[PDB]
PDB file of C-alpha atoms in Angstrom:
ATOM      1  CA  UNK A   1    -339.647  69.475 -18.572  1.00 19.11           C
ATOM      2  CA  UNK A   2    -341.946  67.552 -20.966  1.00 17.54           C
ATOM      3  CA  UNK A   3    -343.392  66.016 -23.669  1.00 17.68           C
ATOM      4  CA  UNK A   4    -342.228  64.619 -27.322  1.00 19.90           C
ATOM      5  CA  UNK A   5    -343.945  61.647 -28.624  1.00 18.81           C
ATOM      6  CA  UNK A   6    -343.163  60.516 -32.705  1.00 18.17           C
ATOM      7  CA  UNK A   7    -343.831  57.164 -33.578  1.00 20.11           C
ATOM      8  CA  UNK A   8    -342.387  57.648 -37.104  1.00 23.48           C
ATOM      9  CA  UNK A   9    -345.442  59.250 -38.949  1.00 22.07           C
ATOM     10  CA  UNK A  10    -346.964  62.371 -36.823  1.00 21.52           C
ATOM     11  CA  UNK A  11    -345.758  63.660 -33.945  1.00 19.59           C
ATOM     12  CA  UNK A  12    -347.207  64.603 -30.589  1.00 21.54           C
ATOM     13  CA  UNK A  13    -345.800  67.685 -28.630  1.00 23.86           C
ATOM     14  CA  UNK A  14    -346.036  70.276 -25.900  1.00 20.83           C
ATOM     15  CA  UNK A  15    -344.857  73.858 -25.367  1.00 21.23           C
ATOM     16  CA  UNK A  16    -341.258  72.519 -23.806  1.00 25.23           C
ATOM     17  CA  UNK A  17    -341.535  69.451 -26.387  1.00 25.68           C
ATOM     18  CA  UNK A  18    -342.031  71.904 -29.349  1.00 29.26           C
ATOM     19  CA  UNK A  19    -339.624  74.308 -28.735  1.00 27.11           C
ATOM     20  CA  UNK A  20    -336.999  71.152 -27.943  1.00 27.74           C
ATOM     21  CA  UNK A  21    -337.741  69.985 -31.698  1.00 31.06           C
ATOM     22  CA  UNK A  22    -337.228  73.214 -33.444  1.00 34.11           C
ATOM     23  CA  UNK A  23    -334.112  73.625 -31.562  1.00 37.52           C
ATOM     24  CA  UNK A  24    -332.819  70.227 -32.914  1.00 37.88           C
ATOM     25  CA  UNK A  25    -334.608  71.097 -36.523  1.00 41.38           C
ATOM     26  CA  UNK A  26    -333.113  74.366 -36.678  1.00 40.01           C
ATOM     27  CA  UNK A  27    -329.560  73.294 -35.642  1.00 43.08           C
ATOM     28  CA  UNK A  28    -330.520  70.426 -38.223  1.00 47.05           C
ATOM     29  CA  UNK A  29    -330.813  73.124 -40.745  1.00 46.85           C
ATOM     30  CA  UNK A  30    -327.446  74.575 -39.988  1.00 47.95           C
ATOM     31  CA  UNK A  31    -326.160  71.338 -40.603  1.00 48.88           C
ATOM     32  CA  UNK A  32    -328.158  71.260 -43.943  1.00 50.24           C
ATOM     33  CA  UNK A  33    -326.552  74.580 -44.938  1.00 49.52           C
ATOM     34  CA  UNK A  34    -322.958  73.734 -44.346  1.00 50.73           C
ATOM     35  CA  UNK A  35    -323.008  69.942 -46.513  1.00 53.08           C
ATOM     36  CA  UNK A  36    -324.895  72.228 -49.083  1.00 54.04           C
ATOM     37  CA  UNK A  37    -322.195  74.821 -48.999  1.00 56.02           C
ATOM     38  CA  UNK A  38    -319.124  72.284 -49.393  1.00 52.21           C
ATOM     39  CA  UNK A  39    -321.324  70.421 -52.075  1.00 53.09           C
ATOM     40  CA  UNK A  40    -321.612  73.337 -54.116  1.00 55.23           C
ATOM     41  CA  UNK A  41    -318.259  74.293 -53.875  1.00 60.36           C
ATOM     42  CA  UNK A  42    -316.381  70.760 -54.602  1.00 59.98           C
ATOM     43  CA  UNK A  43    -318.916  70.349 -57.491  1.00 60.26           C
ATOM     44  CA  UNK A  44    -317.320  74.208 -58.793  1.00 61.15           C
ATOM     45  CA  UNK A  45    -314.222  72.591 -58.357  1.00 60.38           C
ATOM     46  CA  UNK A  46    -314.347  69.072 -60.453  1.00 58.92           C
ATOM     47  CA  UNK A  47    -315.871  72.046 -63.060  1.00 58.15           C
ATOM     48  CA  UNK A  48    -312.953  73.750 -63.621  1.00 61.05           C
ATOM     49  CA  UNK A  49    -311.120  70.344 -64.770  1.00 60.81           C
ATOM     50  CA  UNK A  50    -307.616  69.615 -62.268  1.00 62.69           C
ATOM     51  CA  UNK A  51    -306.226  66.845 -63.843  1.00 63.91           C
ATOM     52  CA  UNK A  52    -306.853  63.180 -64.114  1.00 64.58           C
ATOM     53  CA  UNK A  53    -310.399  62.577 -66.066  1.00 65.10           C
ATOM     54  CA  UNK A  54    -311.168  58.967 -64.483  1.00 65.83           C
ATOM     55  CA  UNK A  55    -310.330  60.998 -61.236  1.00 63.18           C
ATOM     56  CA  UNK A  56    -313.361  63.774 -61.658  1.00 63.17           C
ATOM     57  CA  UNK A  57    -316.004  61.120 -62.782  1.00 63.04           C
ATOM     58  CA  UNK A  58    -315.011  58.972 -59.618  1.00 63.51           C
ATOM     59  CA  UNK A  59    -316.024  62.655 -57.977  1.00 65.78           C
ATOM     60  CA  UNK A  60    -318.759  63.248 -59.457  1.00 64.49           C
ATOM     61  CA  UNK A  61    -319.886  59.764 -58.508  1.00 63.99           C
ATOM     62  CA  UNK A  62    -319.316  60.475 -54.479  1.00 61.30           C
ATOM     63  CA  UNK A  63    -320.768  64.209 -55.118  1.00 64.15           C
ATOM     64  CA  UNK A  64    -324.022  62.986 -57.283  1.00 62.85           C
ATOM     65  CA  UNK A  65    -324.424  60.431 -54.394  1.00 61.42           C
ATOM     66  CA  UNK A  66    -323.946  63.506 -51.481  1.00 58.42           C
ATOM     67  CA  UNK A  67    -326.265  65.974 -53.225  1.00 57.61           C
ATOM     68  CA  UNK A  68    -329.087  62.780 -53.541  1.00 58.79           C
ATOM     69  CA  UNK A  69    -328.361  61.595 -50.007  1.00 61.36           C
ATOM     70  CA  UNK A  70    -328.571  65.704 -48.793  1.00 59.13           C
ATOM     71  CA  UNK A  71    -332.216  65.963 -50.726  1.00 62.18           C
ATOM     72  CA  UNK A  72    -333.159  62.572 -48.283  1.00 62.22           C
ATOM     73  CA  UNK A  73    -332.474  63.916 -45.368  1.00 56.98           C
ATOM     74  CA  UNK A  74    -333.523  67.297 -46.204  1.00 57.63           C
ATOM     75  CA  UNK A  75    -336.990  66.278 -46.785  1.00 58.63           C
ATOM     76  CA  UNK A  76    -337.350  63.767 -44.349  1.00 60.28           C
ATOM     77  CA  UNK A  77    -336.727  66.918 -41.477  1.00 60.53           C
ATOM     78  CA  UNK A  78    -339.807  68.582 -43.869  1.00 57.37           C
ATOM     79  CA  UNK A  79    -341.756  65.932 -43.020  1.00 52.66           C
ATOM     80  CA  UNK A  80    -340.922  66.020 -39.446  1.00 53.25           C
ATOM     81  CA  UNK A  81    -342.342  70.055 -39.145  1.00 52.52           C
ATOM     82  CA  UNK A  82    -345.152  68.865 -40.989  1.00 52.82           C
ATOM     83  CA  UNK A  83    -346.657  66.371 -38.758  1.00 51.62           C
ATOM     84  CA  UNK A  84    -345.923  68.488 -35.737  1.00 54.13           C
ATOM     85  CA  UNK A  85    -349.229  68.648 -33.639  1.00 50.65           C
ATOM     86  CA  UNK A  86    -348.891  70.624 -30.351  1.00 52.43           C
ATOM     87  CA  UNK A  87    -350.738  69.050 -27.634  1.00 54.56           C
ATOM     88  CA  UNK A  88    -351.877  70.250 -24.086  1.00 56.70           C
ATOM     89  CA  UNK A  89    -352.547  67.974 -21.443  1.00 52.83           C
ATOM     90  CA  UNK A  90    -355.301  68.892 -18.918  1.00 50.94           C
ATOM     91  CA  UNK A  91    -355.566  67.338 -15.357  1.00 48.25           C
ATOM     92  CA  UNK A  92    -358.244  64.639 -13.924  1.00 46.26           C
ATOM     93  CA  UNK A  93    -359.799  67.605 -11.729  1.00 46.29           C
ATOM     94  CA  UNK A  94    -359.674  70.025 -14.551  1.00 46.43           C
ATOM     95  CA  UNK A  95    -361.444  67.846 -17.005  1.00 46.69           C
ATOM     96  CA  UNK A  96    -365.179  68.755 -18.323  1.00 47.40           C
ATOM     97  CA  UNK A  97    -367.960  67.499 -15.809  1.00 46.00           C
ATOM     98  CA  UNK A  98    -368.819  64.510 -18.015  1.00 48.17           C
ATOM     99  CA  UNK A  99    -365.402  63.112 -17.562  1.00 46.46           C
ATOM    100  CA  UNK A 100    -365.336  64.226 -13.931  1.00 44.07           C
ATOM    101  CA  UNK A 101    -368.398  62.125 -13.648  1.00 46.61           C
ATOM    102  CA  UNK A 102    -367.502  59.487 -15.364  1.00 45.66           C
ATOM    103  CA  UNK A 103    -364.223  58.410 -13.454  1.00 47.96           C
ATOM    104  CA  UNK A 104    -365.271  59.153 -10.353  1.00 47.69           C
ATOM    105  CA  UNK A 105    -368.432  56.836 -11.153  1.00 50.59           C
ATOM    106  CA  UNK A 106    -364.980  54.517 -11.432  1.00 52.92           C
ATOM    107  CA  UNK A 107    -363.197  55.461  -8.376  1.00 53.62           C
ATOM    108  CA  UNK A 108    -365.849  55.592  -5.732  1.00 52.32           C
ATOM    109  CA  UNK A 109    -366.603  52.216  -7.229  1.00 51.17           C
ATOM    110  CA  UNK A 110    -363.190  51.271  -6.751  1.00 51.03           C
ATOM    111  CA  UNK A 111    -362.438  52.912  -3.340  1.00 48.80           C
ATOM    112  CA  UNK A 112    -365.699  50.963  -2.029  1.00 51.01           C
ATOM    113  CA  UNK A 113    -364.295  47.752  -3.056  1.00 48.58           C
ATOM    114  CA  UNK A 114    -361.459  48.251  -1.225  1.00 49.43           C
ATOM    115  CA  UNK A 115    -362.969  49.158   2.006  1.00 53.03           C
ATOM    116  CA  UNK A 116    -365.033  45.924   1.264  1.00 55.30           C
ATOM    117  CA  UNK A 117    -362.341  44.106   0.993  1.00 53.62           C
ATOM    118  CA  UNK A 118    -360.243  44.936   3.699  1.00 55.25           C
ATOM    119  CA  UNK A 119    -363.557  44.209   5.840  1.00 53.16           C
ATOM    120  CA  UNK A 120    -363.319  40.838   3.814  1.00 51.25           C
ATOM    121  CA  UNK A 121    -359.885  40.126   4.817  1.00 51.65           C
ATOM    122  CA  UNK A 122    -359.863  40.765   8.645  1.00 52.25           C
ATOM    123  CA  UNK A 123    -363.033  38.513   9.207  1.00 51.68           C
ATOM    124  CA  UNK A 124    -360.689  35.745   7.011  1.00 51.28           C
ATOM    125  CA  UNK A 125    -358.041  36.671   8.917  1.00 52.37           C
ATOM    126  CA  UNK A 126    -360.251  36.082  12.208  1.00 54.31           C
ATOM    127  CA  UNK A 127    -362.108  33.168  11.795  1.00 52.92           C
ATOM    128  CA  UNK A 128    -358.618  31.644  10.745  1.00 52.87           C
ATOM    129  CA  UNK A 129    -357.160  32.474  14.325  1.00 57.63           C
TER     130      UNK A 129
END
């Protein structure tokens, strides 16, 4: 297919590019949903108060830790969908007349050289025989 172009900050995309992304975002969600889920439900837990004191604060250490790492990544994907510009990429001989114009100034001049210089390089190629 196409397209997909983020250099960290924005990011540039196409039809095939864009809906590739918001697959991966929206699976990205899912993922957000379930560590949210199991987050909410081992914090419930260390609530209720099963034993061992130094034990739940050691929990609530890794959870507090979870829940902050969670809210990174979480808004670093928000970010992502943010600075999501679609792009659309249109051909050399579909382009307005003033770029038409303006490389084929470029390419005749080119194509002339070449010619030019083949000419160049069978009369070296002569003389030298």
């Amino acid at each position: 297919d196409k397209i997909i172009v983020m250099g960290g900050k924005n990011a540039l995309v196409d039809d095939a590019g864009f809906k590739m992304l918001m697959q991966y975002e929206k699976h990205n969600l899912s993922n957000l949903q379930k560590a949210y889920d199991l987050n909410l439900r081992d914090v419930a837990d260390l609530e209720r108060g099963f034993l061992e004191k130094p034990k739940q604060v050691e929990m609530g250490k890794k959870l507090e830790k979870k829940v902050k790492y969670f809210n990174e990544e979480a808004e670093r994907h928000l970010e992502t969908l943010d600075g999501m510009n679609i792009i659309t990429e249109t051909t050399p001989e579909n382009q307005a007349k003033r770029n038409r114009e303006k490389r084929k100034t470029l390419v005749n001049g080119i194509q002339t050289l070449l010619n030019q210089n083949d000419a160049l390089l069978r009369r070296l190629q002569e003389y030298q025989s």
